[PDB]
Design a binder for this molecule. Structure first.
Ligand SMILES: O=P(O)(O)OP(=O)(O)OCCCCO
Ligand code: SF4
Length: 309
């Protein structure tokens, strides 16, 4: 059985920065360091950090006075930030710079009192954080997930309307929502294409090329990671069996029995050691040396804030 590796795969620049922010906090200040939400949606990364004394909470009212609190890479609402700010807390912000870029647009729309539409998945923490930058009651901030949602949306002034997206969506599905938004609201203003980040776009392009070659695709990533689920979905829609797995223990022998080519990729929140262990297990199940595919080069790094070097 041949094993192909997608390229690019695995950690993006925002995830590497956010993990480094927690580790450095722990190294500088000691345990405990509190973190609002899983710093990234990866069970291994979060368990790792938990065993080293990070405490992950959902709500700020779970954090003691005077503690150190880190916001996860997904970002947080103005309300969360004020709730932390007017509290005793030392805060470091691990929000990815590419999520903050979208927040700055929503904030500008809010100040002008002009309506904004976010394309994103209800309940996702990045969506809560981004919707949560809009506060002007004179305007409005609306979430849409699909063309159907666009077809039922009514707004107050469609002459003054902008859109923004979550960064970890399907490029193809988002394109269909934006096509609907432009047809419904011909004056709507937005980015050229979407706010989908380089890392999401690049891993979906890489998984398309992988699925073209492989009969079965394993995507290393946790169930609550949006971008990881989009990679699995993409391979499934190309007609390949695709599984989202946390680690090598999850591989069921039936999935690769009689399979001549298996592909492996990893979401932006999944560490390389997990892919290494998945490859070692596929080798036990008859796979040969892992062959990395040729891929688009990634060169972006985001540094930790100087306070945490
Ligand atoms: O893919 P999602 O947005 O669920 O988040 P993740 O933690 O799995 O991957 C890194 C994204 C962090 C902010 O975009
Ligand atoms: S997936 Fe994209 S937006 Fe999210 S942390 Fe990575 S680079 Fe940033």
């Amino acid at each position: 059985m041949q094993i192909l590796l997608a390229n690019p795969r695995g950690f993006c620049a925002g995830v590497d920065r956010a993990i480094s922010i927690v580790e450095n906090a722990l190294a500088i200040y000691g345990a405990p360091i509190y973190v609002r939400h899983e710093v990234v949606h990866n069970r291994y990364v979060v368990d790792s950090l938990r065993e080293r004394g990070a405490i992950f909470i959902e709500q700020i009212s779970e954090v003691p006075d005077g503690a150190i609190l880190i916001f996860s890479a997904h970002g947080v609402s103005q309300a969360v930030r004020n709730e932390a700010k007017s509290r005793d807390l030392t805060v470091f912000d691990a929000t990815c710079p590419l999520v903050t870029k979208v927040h700055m647009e929503v904030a500008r729309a809010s100040r002008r009192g002009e309506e904004s539409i976010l394309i994103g998945h209800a309940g996702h923490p990045e969506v809560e954080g981004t919707m949560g930058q809009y506060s002007n009651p004179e305007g409005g901030m609306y979430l849409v997930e699909s063309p159907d949602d666009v077809w039922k949306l009514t707004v107050k002034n469609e002459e003054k309307l902008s859109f923004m997206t979550q960064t970890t969506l399907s490029v193809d599905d988002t394109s269909d929502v934006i096509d609907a938004l432009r047809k419904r609201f011909p004056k709507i203003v937005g980015p050229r294409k979407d706010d989908i980040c380089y890392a999401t776009t690049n891993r979906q392009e890489a998984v398309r090329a992988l699925a073209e070659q492989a009969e079965v695709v394993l995507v290393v990533g946790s169930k609550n990671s949006s971008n990881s689920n989009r990679l699995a979905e993409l391979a499934q829609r190309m007609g390949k069996r695709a599984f989202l797995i946390d680690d090598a223990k999850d591989i069921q022998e039936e999935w690769v029995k009689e399979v001549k080519c298996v592909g492996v990729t990893a979401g932006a929140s999944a560490p390389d050691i997990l892919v290494q262990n998945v490859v070692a297990r596929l080798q036990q199940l008859g796979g040969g040396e892992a062959i990395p595919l040729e891929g688009r080069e990634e060169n972006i790094v985001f540094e930790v804030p100087k306070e945490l070097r």
